[PDB]
Amino acid sequence: FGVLAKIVNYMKTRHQRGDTHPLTLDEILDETQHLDIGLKQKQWLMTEALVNNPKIEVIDGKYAFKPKYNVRDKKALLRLLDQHDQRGLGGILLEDIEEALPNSQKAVKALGDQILFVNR
Amino acid sequence: LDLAGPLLAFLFRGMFKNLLKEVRIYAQKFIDRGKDFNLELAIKTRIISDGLKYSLATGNWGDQKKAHQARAGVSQVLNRLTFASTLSHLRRLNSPIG
Amino acid sequence: TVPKLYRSVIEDVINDVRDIFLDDGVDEQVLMELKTLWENKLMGQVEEEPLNSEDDVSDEEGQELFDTENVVVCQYDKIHRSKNKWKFHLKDGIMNLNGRDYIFSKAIGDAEW
Amino acid sequence: MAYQLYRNTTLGNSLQESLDELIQSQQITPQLALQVLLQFDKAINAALAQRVRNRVNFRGSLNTYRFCDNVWTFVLNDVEFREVTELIKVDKVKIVACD
Amino acid sequence: LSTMIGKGTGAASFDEFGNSKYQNRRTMSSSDRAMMNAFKEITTMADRINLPRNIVDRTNNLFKQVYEQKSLKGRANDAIASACLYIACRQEGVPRTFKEICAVSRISKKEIGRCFKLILKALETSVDLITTGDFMSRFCSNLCLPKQVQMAATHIARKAVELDLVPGRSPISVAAAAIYMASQASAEKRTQKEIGDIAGVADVTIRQSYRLIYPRAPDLFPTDFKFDTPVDKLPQL
Amino acid sequence: FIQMSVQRIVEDAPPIDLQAEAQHASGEVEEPPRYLLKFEQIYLSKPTHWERDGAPSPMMPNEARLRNLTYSAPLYVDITKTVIKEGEEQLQTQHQKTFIGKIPIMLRSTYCLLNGLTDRDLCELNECPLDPGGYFIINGSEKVLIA
Amino acid sequence: PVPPLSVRPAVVMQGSARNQDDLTHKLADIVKINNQLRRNEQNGAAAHVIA
Amino acid sequence: TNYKPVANHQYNIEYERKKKEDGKRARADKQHVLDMLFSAFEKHQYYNLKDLVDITKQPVVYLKEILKEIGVQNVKGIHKNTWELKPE
Amino acid sequence: TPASESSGIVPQLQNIVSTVNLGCKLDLKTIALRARNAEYNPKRFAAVIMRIREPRTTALIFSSGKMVCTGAKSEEQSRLAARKYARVVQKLGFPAKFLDFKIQNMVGSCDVKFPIRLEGLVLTHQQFSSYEPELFPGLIYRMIKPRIVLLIFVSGKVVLTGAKVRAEIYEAFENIYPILKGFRK
């Protein structure tokens, strides 16, 4: 179990470094020096641990970063918000910063476009 | 007839148990923290000292807060009017009643 | 006396790894070869940091390179100091002085720096 | 848990050198050698506790000292080891201590 | 503030299904509920050494001043309470030793003392200096020593400090050695160990102080006293 | 009541023991410490008074009335501490003799000071030889219990 | 209606206005818990505790 | 009514214990502490923070600082809280 | 001054406390490990302890890069010691600086050589003096002239502390000396 949380921490660090490109389990285990964690642990990790996580992005025959397998569009769904009978999604700033890029660069344009900040 | 002894035995009994619980509460809080027990520090001497003393003074029987209304004149200031009132008052006995 | 102790140790170690050698499937001749080998082996700058005007805050690079130190390996019970006065309460020790072999169950010392 | 420090000993090193020969000859495994070292460690610790009974008192000059990870390391000069029935003077000694 | 409620008449008083007759009472003064708990400790302690309520009332009063100033909020109430008991006892002219207050308190002698100096500065006030006379009574009485011995002891103590025979010494140790001298000259001889056990001082502290006063022993006694043993026959320790 | 009942009550059957919690989140080894408290013989000293000085002395009922004292005596008990833990130790036991409180004395009973004295000592002490006694003195008031 | 002081005679009995009558003590709970109930309700409240 | 020492004898024992090695903690080496959290996650999905400081021997403010970084929390009933390394 | 030629004996400096900041973050573990004549106990304390032989001083260096140097019997020796410490640290390959070197405390002592009456001194200065034999065998005087603390003993010995510059010691001592002479047994 604890090696899977070390893999998720490395993949989270890969997005924080600037990247969401898919890798094989090998390339992850090599960089993290877990290649020799034992063939039984590598097999379990491949055929149960990266299968039991529903948030993993499966792309190009490989696994990618990490909390969202969909809707990582890194911008607000303005189109849904246009519809006053169904417009609905404010969320937490931490998910949006986690998603892709820092808030501030997007926000300068957004402070005069769509965004409102509430200290909730 | 409940004289001085059966009446006192009651009052002191309730107080010593009250004191036994107080040493238990004290020893339990310490032992949660750990290692420094002192037996002499635990005893709240006032439980006995003041408890018998208050009841003998007011007349109010039993411990306070809850039950007390049961008995009121179990104690009195001794009537020193003649020699006979003293002697008679020391030997007076009462039935509880409406 | 103490060569005997090392002998005692020879007996205890060899006996306690016999079974382990056995568990690996290794032959007792290797263990005997081990023992024989072992027995044979046994015998700004102007104000911010003008510090270079204070160089040599040392008398020597080191002393352990000289190997002039007979070695001592031991556990400690108490270490104490009072200024230049140090106090040592040592225990369960193995000494080797000028090639000679020594031991102690307890050692107590004093030293000045 | 007993301390690995006695593995540093000349005796302990003489053992390791004997083991490395057996490893060079590949008659045993490195893992097995490590296991012999653990047994020797326990054995020599047990032997010190049970057998050794002598005591020595000493005085000298302290030259240098270290303390890290609960391990004291000294180097004393002009040291004088005194036993109840013996005397040993030495120019310099290295002392490593852990407990 | 206000009132409280309890019991139930034994009639309706719903827990309806569960077992909670009508309603439980409620706390009201939690913010200061530790001032009342300080007072509870002050009274308990006080009774362990059996002071009159008047001392206890001043102690209670000193605390309320220190607490409201909040200047010492960082230390345990039991440390501040123990200091109040010590100050109050000294100001009332019946000093207690720190060793005595430590015995009844759960606070160590060091912390009561440190708090004590800080409170004196905190209340911007001072106290009288202790003298030997202030303890002579309690000690001689607890050892069942006759009134006459106590009187001599007081005199010996008093005369000795007047003669400056003990330049740097606690008044307690000097008192203790005086008492010992008096008692060893009395029929009711008591061991150094007993006195030391009562005064708190080490028996070696008595040994030194007795050794220092012994060379002038003849001159220190009061003229009214009648020896049981000649002073040329008073033992040394 | 003294010769029997106050003894009977502490010689009851509630010896208390206390076992603090241990091996929280982890432990293994061997001891969640355990303490037991026992009570023995009870002692009652003749009725004493302590001055603000701290020095105790005998009280006499006439004094107790004038100065409004309470005529009571101090009570002591033998207590035991008994460390029979889970294994490491069992015998470490210690006896104490401790002041627990002050009980009022009934006047001229065997625990009063008046109980042995003749006509001469009582006239001397300032107490009337003809006074029946048998009643408590509480804060300077004579308080008699009623059957 | 809060009785005026003439109904709540400030029992005095020595003290220093120590006699803040007992009806006043009942009134001090009523304002206290009501002050508390209004303030409780001003914020968020579980349905049972307000009950 | 007992001789009054400088402090309780046992209090001094308590002082001596406090005065033996244990006191300050080993905040250094985050990775080994990270490993210990992983090891906690090897036995069970959630634990009491009281247990977490006991098993780690680290200061609370720091153990929190780490638990904010790599995990989340979940409370139950009356402020009874447990923390989890985001099981997935 | 005439008033300082009677008690002129003039007090002797025994201890100085100074600080200096190296202005850089440091790895105490590595430092402690590499350095000779040094001690570091992380499980019982948070800093490394260092000692030089010359003028038996000792310095304490913190992870922040701040350090404190004590033991000098003179400001020169304090400047000398601080520099010697900052040197060996430089020699550790770390960007050691001499920046913010400052005296924090100075201790002085002297002997007036006469028996002193203490009950009077505490009487006359109850707003300042405090003498409690039950706590410490020596009267503590808290001066507010050059806000200084003094320890006065029956022997005649006197210690003074709380100063950062020598003038404050002479001033505190010139001030208190007449009183002490006037309470001479």
UniProtKB/Swiss-Prot annotation, chain C:
Task: Give GO BP annotations, semicolon-separated.
Answer: positive regulation of transcription by RNA polymerase II; positive regulation of transcription initiation by RNA polymerase II; RNA polymerase II preinitiation complex assembly; transcription by RNA polymerase II
Q: Tell me what effect the entry lists for residue 53 to A.
A: Strongly reduces phosphorylation. Eliminates phosphorylation
- Which terms does the record give in the GO molecular function aspect? DNA binding; protein heterodimerization activity; RNA polymerase II core promoter sequence-specific DNA binding; RNA polymerase II general transcription initiation factor activity; RNA polymerase II general transcription initiation factor binding; RNA polymerase II-specific DNA-binding transcription factor binding; TBP-class protein binding
Q: Which residues bind DNA?
A: 80-81
Indicate where this protein is primarily found: nucleus
Q: Tell me the compartments it is located in.
A: Nucleus
Annotated positions of the Phosphoserine modification: 53, 58
Annotated signal sequence range: none
UniProt xrefs under Pfam families = TFIIA (PF03153)
Q: How is it modified after translation?
A: The alpha and beta subunits are postranslationally produced from the precursor form by TASP1. The cleavage promotes proteasomal degradation.
Alphabetized SMART domains for the sequence: TFIIA
Function of the molecule: TFIIA is a component of the transcription machinery of RNA polymerase II and plays an important role in transcriptional activation. TFIIA in a complex with TBP mediates transcriptional activity.
Subunit architecture: TFIIA is a heterodimer of the large unprocessed subunit 1 and a small subunit gamma. It was originally believed to be a heterotrimer of an alpha (p35), a beta (p19) and a gamma subunit (p12). TFIIA forms a complex with TBP.
UniProtKB/Swiss-Prot annotation, chain F:
What is the protein's known function? Catalytic core component of RNA polymerase II (Pol II), a DNA-dependent RNA polymerase which synthesizes mRNA precursors and many functional non-coding RNAs using the four ribonucleoside triphosphates as substrates. Pol II-mediated transcription cycle proceeds through transcription initiation, transcription elongation and transcription termination stages.
Subunit and interaction comment: Component of the RNA polymerase II (Pol II) core complex consisting of 12 subunits: a ten-subunit catalytic core composed of POLR2A/RPB1, POLR2B/RPB2, POLR2C/RPB3, POLR2I/RPB9, POLR2J/RPB11, POLR2E/RPABC1, POLR2F/RPABC2, POLR2H/RPABC3, POLR2K/RPABC4 and POLR2L/RPABC5 and a mobile stalk composed of two subunits POLR2D/RPB4 and POLR2G/RPB7, protruding from the core and functioning primarily in transcription initiation. Part of Pol II(G) complex, in which Pol II core associates with an additional subunit POLR2M; unlike conventional Pol II, Pol II(G) functions as a transcriptional repressor.
Q: Which organism is it from?
A: Homo sapiens (Human)
UniProt-annotated location(s): Nucleus
Report TM segments: none
Source species, domain of life? Eukaryota
Its family? Belongs to the RNA polymerase beta chain family.
Q: What is this protein called?
A: DNA-directed RNA polymerase II subunit RPB2
From Swiss-Prot, chain G:
Q: Where in the cell is it found?
A: Nucleus; Cytoplasm; Chromosome
Q: Which residues form a coiled coil?
A: none
Briefly state the modifications made to the protein after translation: The tandem heptapeptide repeats in the C-terminal domain (CTD) can be highly phosphorylated. The phosphorylation activates Pol II. Phosphorylation occurs mainly at residues 'Ser-2' and 'Ser-5' of the heptapeptide repeat and is mediated, at least, by CDK7 and CDK9. POLR2A associated with DNA is specifically phosphorylated at 'Ser-5' of the CTD by CDK7, promoting transcription initiation by triggering dissociation from DNA. Phosphorylated at 'Ser-2', Ser-5' and 'Ser-7' of the CTD by CDK9 (P-TEFb complex), promoting transcription elongation. Among tandem heptapeptide repeats of the C-terminal domain (CTD) some do not match the Y-S-P-T-S-P-S consensus, the seventh serine residue 'Ser-7' being replaced by a lysine. 'Lys-7' in these non-consensus heptapeptide repeats can be alternatively acetylated, methylated and dimethylated. EP300 is one of the enzyme able to acetylate 'Lys-7'. Acetylation at 'Lys-7' of non-consensus heptapeptide repeats is associated with 'Ser-2' phosphorylation and active transcription. Regulates initiation or early elongation steps of transcription specially for inducible genes.
Which protein family is it in?
Answer: Belongs to the RNA polymerase beta' chain family.
Protein name (record): DNA-directed RNA polymerase II subunit RPB1
UniProtKB/Swiss-Prot annotation, chain H:
Protein's recorded name: General transcription factor IIF subunit 2
Q: Name one GO biological process term.
A: transcription by RNA polymerase II
- Which Gene Ontology MF annotations are present? DNA binding; RNA polymerase II general transcription initiation factor activity
What positions belong to coiled-coil segments? none
Residues binding DNA are: 77, 79
Keyword Nucleus belongs to the record: yes
The subunit structure is: Heterodimer of an alpha and a beta subunit. Interacts with HTATSF1 and GPBP1. Interacts with URI1. Interacts with GTF2B (via N-terminus); this interaction is inhibited in presence of GTF2F1.
Keywords tagged on the record: Acetylation, DNA-binding, Nucleus, Phosphoprotein, Transcription, Transcription regulation
Instruction: Enumerate the subcellular locations listed in this protein's record, separating them with semicolons.
Output: Nucleus
User: What is its biological role?
Assistant: TFIIF is a general transcription initiation factor that binds to RNA polymerase II and helps to recruit it to the initiation complex in collaboration with TFIIB.
Family the UniProt entry places it in: Belongs to the TFIIF beta subunit family.
Chief place where the protein resides: nucleus
Question: GO CC annotation: what is one?
Answer: transcription factor TFIIF complex
